[PDB]
Design an enzyme around this catalytic site. Structure first.
Site, PDB file in Angstrom:
ATOM      1  N   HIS A 214       8.631  46.344 -17.971  1.00 59.56           N
ATOM      2  CA  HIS A 214       7.461  45.565 -18.150  1.00 59.56           C
ATOM      3  C   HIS A 214       7.819  43.933 -18.741  1.00 59.56           C
ATOM      4  O   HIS A 214       8.326  42.513 -17.948  1.00 59.56           O
ATOM      5  CB  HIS A 214       6.803  45.503 -18.181  1.00 59.56           C
ATOM      6  CG  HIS A 214       5.191  44.629 -18.057  1.00 59.56           C
ATOM      7  ND1 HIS A 214       5.091  44.569 -17.271  1.00 59.56           N
ATOM      8  CD2 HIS A 214       5.132  43.651 -18.390  1.00 59.56           C
ATOM      9  CE1 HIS A 214       3.739  43.067 -16.894  1.00 59.56           C
ATOM     10  NE2 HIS A 214       3.816  43.243 -18.037  1.00 59.56           N
TER      11      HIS A 214
ATOM     12  N   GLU B  85      11.676  42.776 -18.000  1.00 56.21           N
ATOM     13  CA  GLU B  85      11.523  41.632 -16.357  1.00 56.21           C
ATOM     14  C   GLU B  85      11.156  39.994 -16.279  1.00 56.21           C
ATOM     15  O   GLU B  85      11.239  39.790 -15.903  1.00 56.21           O
ATOM     16  CB  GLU B  85      11.137  42.891 -15.490  1.00 56.21           C
ATOM     17  CG  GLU B  85       9.665  43.224 -15.619  1.00 56.21           C
ATOM     18  CD  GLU B  85       8.379  42.207 -14.587  1.00 56.21           C
ATOM     19  OE1 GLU B  85       9.274  41.020 -13.752  1.00 56.21           O
ATOM     20  OE2 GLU B  85       7.412  42.311 -15.508  1.00 56.21           O
TER      21      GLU B  85
ATOM     22  N   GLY C  93     -13.218  55.963   1.954  1.00 53.10           N
ATOM     23  CA  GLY C  93     -12.604  56.396   1.365  1.00 53.10           C
ATOM     24  C   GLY C  93     -11.128  56.768   2.167  1.00 53.10           C
ATOM     25  O   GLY C  93     -10.771  55.980   2.992  1.00 53.10           O
TER      26      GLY C  93
ATOM     27  N   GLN D  70      -6.632  58.394   2.050  1.00 52.44           N
ATOM     28  CA  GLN D  70      -5.211  58.564   1.043  1.00 52.44           C
ATOM     29  C   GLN D  70      -4.773  57.627   0.599  1.00 52.44           C
ATOM     30  O   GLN D  70      -4.544  56.535   0.674  1.00 52.44           O
ATOM     31  CB  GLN D  70      -4.372  58.986   2.566  1.00 52.44           C
ATOM     32  CG  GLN D  70      -3.983  57.889   3.225  1.00 52.44           C
ATOM     33  CD  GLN D  70      -3.054  57.133   2.142  1.00 52.44           C
ATOM     34  OE1 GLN D  70      -1.608  57.347   1.939  1.00 52.44           O
ATOM     35  NE2 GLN D  70      -2.619  55.596   2.869  1.00 52.44           N
TER      36      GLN D  70
ATOM     37  N   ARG E  76       1.618  35.005   6.167  1.00 49.93           N
ATOM     38  CA  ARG E  76       2.070  33.840   5.114  1.00 49.93           C
ATOM     39  C   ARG E  76       2.738  34.260   4.022  1.00 49.93           C
ATOM     40  O   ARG E  76       3.778  35.379   4.017  1.00 49.93           O
ATOM     41  CB  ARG E  76       0.786  34.473   3.588  1.00 49.93           C
ATOM     42  CG  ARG E  76      -0.677  34.250   4.234  1.00 49.93           C
ATOM     43  CD  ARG E  76      -0.781  32.221   4.360  1.00 49.93           C
ATOM     44  NE  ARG E  76       0.160  31.490   5.582  1.00 49.93           N
ATOM     45  CZ  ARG E  76       0.669  30.348   5.280  1.00 49.93           C
ATOM     46  NH1 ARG E  76       0.430  30.024   4.659  1.00 49.93           N
ATOM     47  NH2 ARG E  76       1.163  30.105   6.591  1.00 49.93           N
TER      48      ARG E  76
ATOM     49  N   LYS F  39      -2.171  18.998  14.036  1.00 51.52           N
ATOM     50  CA  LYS F  39      -2.487  19.915  15.410  1.00 51.52           C
ATOM     51  C   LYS F  39      -2.831  20.869  15.059  1.00 51.52           C
ATOM     52  O   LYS F  39      -3.154  21.340  13.652  1.00 51.52           O
ATOM     53  CB  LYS F  39      -1.058  19.989  15.935  1.00 51.52           C
ATOM     54  CG  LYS F  39      -1.257  20.456  17.751  1.00 51.52           C
ATOM     55  CD  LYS F  39      -0.048  21.200  17.415  1.00 51.52           C
ATOM     56  CE  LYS F  39      -0.677  21.665  19.223  1.00 51.52           C
ATOM     57  NZ  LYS F  39      -1.227  23.198  19.465  1.00 51.52           N
ATOM     58  N   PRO F  40      -3.922  21.793  15.856  1.00 58.61           N
ATOM     59  CA  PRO F  40      -4.416  23.184  15.354  1.00 58.61           C
ATOM     60  C   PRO F  40      -3.439  24.329  15.715  1.00 58.61           C
ATOM     61  O   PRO F  40      -1.992  24.180  15.561  1.00 58.61           O
ATOM     62  CB  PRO F  40      -5.707  23.906  16.554  1.00 58.61           C
ATOM     63  CG  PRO F  40      -5.693  21.838  16.610  1.00 58.61           C
ATOM     64  CD  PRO F  40      -4.743  21.557  17.285  1.00 58.61           C
TER      65      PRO F  40
ATOM     66  N   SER G 239      -9.942  29.799  16.201  1.00 55.75           N
ATOM     67  CA  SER G 239     -11.140  29.733  15.644  1.00 55.75           C
ATOM     68  C   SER G 239     -11.337  28.333  14.926  1.00 55.75           C
ATOM     69  O   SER G 239     -11.915  27.415  14.744  1.00 55.75           O
ATOM     70  CB  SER G 239     -10.350  30.716  14.271  1.00 55.75           C
ATOM     71  OG  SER G 239      -9.802  30.268  13.244  1.00 55.75           O
TER      72      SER G 239
END
EC number: 3.4.24.56
Lengths: 948, 940
Positions: free
Chosen positions: B63, B66, B316, B318, B384, B851-852, B856
């Site tokens: 850590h 890096e 809950g 895994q 994204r 422009k959209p 939504s």
């Protein structure tokens, strides 16, 4: 004909010194002396009516008492009298009856002698000019035209005409333009020569009754007016009387079925009976009217309510001609009250039979004698106009000491009179008349003048015989002795707390308490005007309907207890407003808390009957769409107050919203309204501070006891605003009436809020535009009989409005209204400064006047507390400011606010079309107004007033 | 080391980005993304390395390397040159460290592939490790640990890591603090650098790299562009560090914990360690368990737990761990009396497990979840450009290059034997318990090693164990019903003669009003519906407003249990209130919005109230109300501003006092009164037709009439609330004293005018010309505060200008320096050139113009126009066409009459917020008494 007789007059509390005399030419004279009255007055009544007309021309005396205004030999100019009483604040008027026509006027102080000079010599030299005649025929035609569709006058003349056609009673009373000038000229008859014949033969002779309300003395006004009245010359016309009733058995035991315009249902019962005018000492008619139209336990109206056929009634002795008189009973009808009439007549004859069994009573006579004793003793004061005409009206029948103790005091009991009048009221002598809308296609015999339709069917002998033989008693009882009678006659001495104006003696978040004590009048009475305020009253059509039916059934329940108090002199009124509920108690100082406790405790925990609610519902649903039928000046004022408030529900939506009014809905609504609320009250009269505190505490504790009322928070003490105009607009729109063939209009002007300056600007302009508008528009231009100029103040904003009813296109009328504004604009420069003084002084004395009746000053203070002004001395403020005005100031008022070249022009009119349908300046095109809501959508709203 | 292996990758047809996977001979996993339409480029590096690899004596060395490995290459040995190259070209880097990953990623402005790669490749050639990198990254580690002191996630995770086997690398610390880096080594004289070069050379370089490039160049240029500069990585064949045994080796099973928290929180933590099912991605039983536990539907576990009123929510499923072991967690909420019934709760989980053990596994459920996740993969929306790359580089190691897109969004087979295995694993022998509660004071001695929290082993005794196993039965717990509905229709619908670009009014009555727009631009199978219910009774008085509030709140509480399973299918909604009426949103697919909206109307028509639910909502809103003494004073200022300048406004004090009287019968009387008579208004936008839109609204209002006999409103009582007109001269102010925060807020309001077409653009351009220089001068130079804002105000159709500043100051000093800032900007007006002007109006233009990108967005903007009753659908285009025709003198003349100090039209009014230590305003009612009210806007 100078003869004089006077002496001590039994005048009760009153301070007005009195004398009476009579002049040898048959002139009754009353001398009134008072050194504290502002306005002096006099009023002449001629004992000649319109039943004494010539057989050819109808409504001739009506036209004469119109025509006696204009023109004398001493002052032959037309409006001279009227303009002289517009100079010095006087207001003359006249009216016409079957046997009387009664002139009356007012004046200020010494100006009476000048007013009398114009008034007295009308009798010597009336002129009857071209223009007077030719304009008064239009005024008479409008006088008949507003009474065409008025159902009261309609049924009046239909009763007048279906009697003896040989009797003068049948002859028409008012007359339209067709009987006045079209009927004579097609006969070649000169109008003027009858007027001169009629004035010389009938009028000039005798039977006058003059009075003189003067502030000089007794003796000096005496030797003024005795000298001034010897020119009237006796002619010895005999007293015109009628020796018989108009129903000489051809017209007896008869029914009629009348079709009205407005959807109403009424039943009319009439008895012709001989005269008891000579028996004014014992007055059996008061005993009969007291027992028949009573509203108590075991009364007839209680029974008619208990079967639900009749809402309310009134009956009793009805006055008629000198010779004969009538005796009426008038009840309201419901649906099966319309269908089951015969049983109603049976119950009237059973109650009459109950009176036929017990006969007369003496403790009733003692009770009414004590009630009129007290009630005549504690009389407050009199109006300088109207009082003198009333007394001069009753001066004809009484000796010089009985002119005041006229009928308000009764000496003796004559039960033989009660057996005779009881013997007249029988089923042989009854006339019946049914007023119902459903009689369509069934009535052929048409009225000649107005055009209503009716039918007579002789009552089948089976109903008559059953009426006579079946006269027994069911559950009708004599009325229990009253207990609402005062023994509180003790004048309470004013305290060290000698305030002249009501102070806020208690302030909470719940209430507000204002209090004075009477320094002037010194009567044992007090006023109480509690006003309830609540949000839920006007939220919707539905809740406004719930408020009206709630308060309506409230009064319908608490009426039966209340009647004895209202008959005893303790009056009340529950009503609703746009704000909340309105309570007003008024009366003597005896059982104030007792009646008020009961009213409030009753309306706290309140219940509903089923069919009672059904009857009130159906009836008000019928009363809503009745608002089509009124005069279009009222219809126009209704539209003006629609647009010029913040929110306003129209009568159509209010009408439709009764489609959902169910009884559980009301019973859920009631405690939600009564849950939270605010109270603001005026307490005035002969009480103390601590007893006022106890009365108010009493009230709020009764409320908290019943419905657990908690105070309001002061952010929902809202008021409604008024719509702004865009500083240059002239707005208008139109409606169309269905019944009337006439158009109305109202011409609104927004100046400004009430600042101290704007009040006196608009008042001076209002007085200078008052009388000349009556002179040129109704009189000279003959625009219409209904002319109304003056200032309207609503929602704390001043305004100027003109109300003109005529049969015209309204835009011609707008154009000539503006022509009258230009005429006044030029006449403003013409007016001299001295003429301006003869106007600002009339505004001062018109504005300044001390209250005579205690109810007046209490109503004025109340009218200012509900408006949140609280400036109790605006009168002194305004008058002291008023003297510092000029004439160029009123051009500065005229130009920017009222003229046509105005940048701040705030003008808006309302047209109302009729059923079917000299120069004008450049008025711009108007806008149309489709949606009144979309009108108010984008417009600003005015502020409210800063509290003093 | 140029080795390549790839081919065409199956992508669901909506996506068009072309891909290629390969792997270089030096052990580098390579995926290729080609999108020639991205504005900003990015890059990412994933290392499959863990804290376990770091030496047993010093924790978290990799850590700190890096961190320290960022700065300094041999081609660019300067210190910040990478960081400065990303500061020039808008780049931002950020990497994390996990048990089996360290995953570097960053971005760049447009094209800097060559550039950043020259600053990226020689990490593998030459790390530098100089004096200054070391001495700065030790402060960066110390600040990372200092801000991760109070972070509760790390705290509970470390407490789960460390209380197992203390020898197992599961008990290691992931990040590493300052003590292991520079406190123990420098006192032992040990060189960190030589261990860092050991670790870097031996461990990092070997294999299992996941290079990836978010590029916009092509499919090959960047390929042989990175393969050129990635051949210096040299294989070492380091074996994969995996654990063949779980770290909870029967020493720590059947154990509880008692936790002392700083923050007043309460949580309950059930933990199951479970073996590897990563090869079994066909059935994926761990997410199947997360589906069946955390379900909120008919007969669910939490449904009964709500019916007993103890538990708000749970989660809950895994939980992944190391390569070898995996976890299974259950995280439930706690009430007050939940801390006494713990064993009951655990019995209900066991009861549920036993109901699943009784009726067993399900196949049609697996097929339904398979088809729904098939659809959810088919119709993805977007991604994204940052964060994505580190994720997909995370799973590139575990899946072949063909499984990298159908990653987990597809399930092949059903494995009931495995589901039986994990059903046998959920037993009380296996349970690990942890309890969070503030009330654990003086009771926990065993302190955590790093953070310093205190806990307790406190093994569950055996009578509690044995009651779980043999006593196991079922109550009111049932498996969930199928909700297949119809998912077969995804076909797009062609555009008709009605080719409007803006919603047309297809229906007007006195009852409703309906606007409509088929989707032209997206051609996506998604639909949006918006609804307003107008009624007069909403804001009549605090009691009615409280009743409306509680009504919709408890309505949601009623309908949530039925609706949530439908929400899992991809149809979301929202119910809230307005001061005018109620707000209903329905968003999702076109296939079954009609059935859902039908049941929503049928449900909220016939509505009932529960007692303790009403009590919980009541108490809850009493807290939310009397909380309002305790919020941030800039919010305090905005609340008082919206109080004084509207028509009616009830403050929170009256709403607080009036709630004493809200009883159940009163609300049950109020509800049908409200619903009796009302108005509707609706926006319909998506791939739909006109006739079905008209038919759904007709059907809907007919059902509304079917329930409560709906009648229309009167068209004179569609009023709106106006705004108060200042008296043409006024500068008004008053004060409010905060109680909690020792800080003084301030808001400086300015009234211009109604929205005419000129005034919108006057205020937007003038707002922007005072936007960026205020950001430059106020906080930095004038040092007013940290929460400082300016700009427009849109309310009741009226524009405005405001200044929100919260600080701990005297308020009049702050008004005086605010006025100094207005004078500074006033003279800063007259010195403006043409260049600043043109970039500023272009800034406004691109700020407004766009422009959209999704239904939504356009639906929210059109709804945002219908709720204000403006209806101006192309104000964008008109205002932009207007915007370029302005001058400097147009805003000078805009400025002076309204805003200056010697102004005839100066409309100024302030609100003072004090800390705990013009005209005055005594009564706000008596204030609003005498001021006029503005008109409203004419609807186009």
């Amino acid at each position: 004909a100078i003869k004089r007789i006077g002496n001590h007059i039994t005048k009760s509390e009153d301070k007005r010194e009195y004398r009476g005399l009579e002049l040898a030419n048959g002139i009754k004279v009353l001398l009134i002396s008072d050194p504290t009255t502002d306005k002096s007055s006099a009023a002449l009544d001629v004992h000649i009516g319109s039943l004494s007309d010539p057989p050819n021309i109808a409504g001739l005396s009506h036209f004469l008492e119109h025509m006696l205004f204009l023109g004398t030999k001493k002052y032959p100019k037309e409006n001279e009298y009227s303009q002289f009483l517009s100079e010095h604040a006087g207001s003359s008027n006249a009216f016409t009856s079957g046997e009387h026509t009664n002139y009356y006027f007012d004046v200020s102080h010494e100006h009476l002698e000048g007013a009398l000079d114009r008034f007295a010599q009308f009798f010597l030299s009336p002129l009857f000019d071209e223009s007077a005649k030719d304009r008064e025929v239009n005024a008479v035609d409008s006088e008949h035209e507003k009474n065409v569709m008025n159902d009261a006058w309609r049924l009046f003349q239909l009763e007048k005409a279906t009697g003896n056609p040989k009797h003068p009673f049948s002859k028409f009373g008012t007359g339209n333009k067709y009987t006045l000038e079209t009927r004579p000229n097609q006969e070649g008859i000169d109008v003027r020569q009858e007027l001169l014949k009629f004035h010389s033969a009938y009028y000039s002779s005798n039977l006058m009754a003059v009075v003189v309300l003067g502030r000089e003395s007794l003796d000096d006004l005496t030797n003024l007016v005795v000298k001034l009245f010897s020119e009237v010359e006796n002619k010895n016309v005999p007293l015109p009387e009628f020796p018989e009733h108009p129903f000489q058995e051809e017209h007896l035991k008869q029914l009629y079925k009348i079709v009205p315009i407005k959807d109403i249902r009424n039943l009319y019962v009439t008895f012709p009976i001989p005269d008891l005018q000579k028996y004014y000492k014992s007055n059996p008619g008061h005993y009969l009217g007291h027992l028949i139209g009573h509203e108590g336990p075991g009364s007839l109206l209680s029974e008619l309510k208990s079967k639900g056929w009749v809402n309310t009634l009134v009956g009793g002795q009805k006055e008629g001609a000198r010779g004969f008189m009538f005796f009426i009973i008038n009840v309201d009808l419901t649906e099966e009250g319309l269908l089951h009439v015969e049983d109603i007549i049976l119950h009237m004859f059973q109650y009459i039979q109950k009176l036929r069994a017990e006969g007369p009573q003496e403790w009733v006579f003692q009770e009414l004698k004590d009630l009129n004793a007290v009630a005549f003793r504690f009389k407050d004061k009199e109006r300088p106009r109207g009082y003198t005409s009333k007394i001069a009206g009753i001066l004809h029948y009484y000796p010089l000491e009985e002119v005041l103790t006229a009928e308000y005091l009764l000496e003796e009991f004559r039960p033989d009179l009660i057996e005779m009048v009881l013997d007249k009221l029988r089923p042989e002598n009854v006339r019946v008349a049914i007023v119902s809308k459903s009689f369509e296609g069934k009535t052929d015999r048409t009225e000649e003048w107005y055009g209503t339709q009716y039918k007579q069917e002789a009552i089948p002998d089976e109903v008559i015989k059953k009426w006579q033989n079946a006269d027994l008693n069911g559950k009708f009882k004599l009325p229990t002795k009253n207990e609402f009678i005062p023994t509180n006659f003790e004048i309470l001495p004013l305290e060290k707390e000698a305030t002249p104006y009501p102070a806020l003696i208690k302030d909470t978040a719940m209430s507000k308490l204002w209090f004075k004590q009477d320094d002037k009048f010194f009567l044992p009475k007090a006023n109480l005007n509690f006003e309830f305020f609540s949000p839920f009253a006007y939220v919707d059509p539905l809740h406004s309907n719930m408020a009206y039916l709630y308060l309506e059934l409230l009064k319908d329940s608490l009426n039966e207890y209340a009647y004895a108090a209202e008959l005893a002199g303790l009056s009340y009124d529950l009503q609703n407003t746009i704000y909340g509920m309105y309570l007003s108690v008024k009366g003597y100082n005896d059982k104030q808390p007792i009646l008020l406790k009961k009213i409030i405790e009753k309306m706290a925990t309140f219940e509903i009957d089923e069919k009672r609610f059904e009857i009130i519902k159906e009836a008000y649903m019928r009363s809503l769409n009745n608002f089509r039928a009124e005069q279009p000046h009222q219809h126009a004022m209704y539209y003006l107050r629609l647009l010029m408030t913040e929110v306003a529900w129209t009568k159509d939506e209010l009408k439709e919203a009764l489609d959902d009014v169910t009884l559980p809905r009301l019973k859920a609504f009631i405690p939600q309204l009564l849950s939270r609320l605010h109270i603001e009250a005026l307490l005035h009269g002969n009480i103390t501070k601590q007893a006022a505190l106890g009365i108010m505490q009493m009230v709020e504790d009764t409320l908290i006891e019943h419905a657990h009322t908690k105070p309001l928070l002061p952010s929902q003490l809202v008021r409604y605003r008024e719509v702004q105009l865009p500083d240059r607009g002239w707005f208008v729109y139109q409606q169309r009436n269905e019944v009337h063939n006439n158009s109305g209009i109202e011409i609104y002007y927004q100046t400004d809020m009430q600042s101290t300056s704007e009040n006196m600007f608009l008042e001076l302009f209002a007085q200078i535009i008052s009388e000349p508008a009556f002179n040129t528009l109704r009189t000279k231009e003959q625009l219409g009989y209904i002319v109304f100029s003056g200032p309207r103040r609503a929602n704390g904003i001043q305004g100027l409005r003109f109300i003109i009813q005529s049969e015209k296109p309204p835009h011609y009328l707008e154009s000539r209204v503006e022509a009258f504004l230009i005429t006044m604009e030029k006449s403003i420069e013409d007016m001299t400064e001295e003429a301006f003084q003869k106007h600002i002084q009339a505004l001062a004395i018109r504005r300044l006047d001390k209250p005579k009746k205690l109810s007046a000053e209490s109503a004025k203070y109340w009218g200012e507390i509900i408006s949140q002004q609280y400036n109790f001395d605006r009168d002194n403020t305004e008058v002291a400011y008023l003297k510092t005005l000029t004439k160029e100031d009123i051009i500065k008022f005229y130009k920017e606010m009222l003229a046509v070249d105005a940048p701040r022009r705030h003008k808006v009119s309302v047209h109302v079309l009729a059923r079917e349908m000299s120069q004008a300046p450049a008025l711009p095109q108007p806008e149309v107004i489709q949606n009144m809501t979309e009108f108010k959508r984008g417009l600003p709203l005015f502020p409210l007033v800063k509290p003093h």
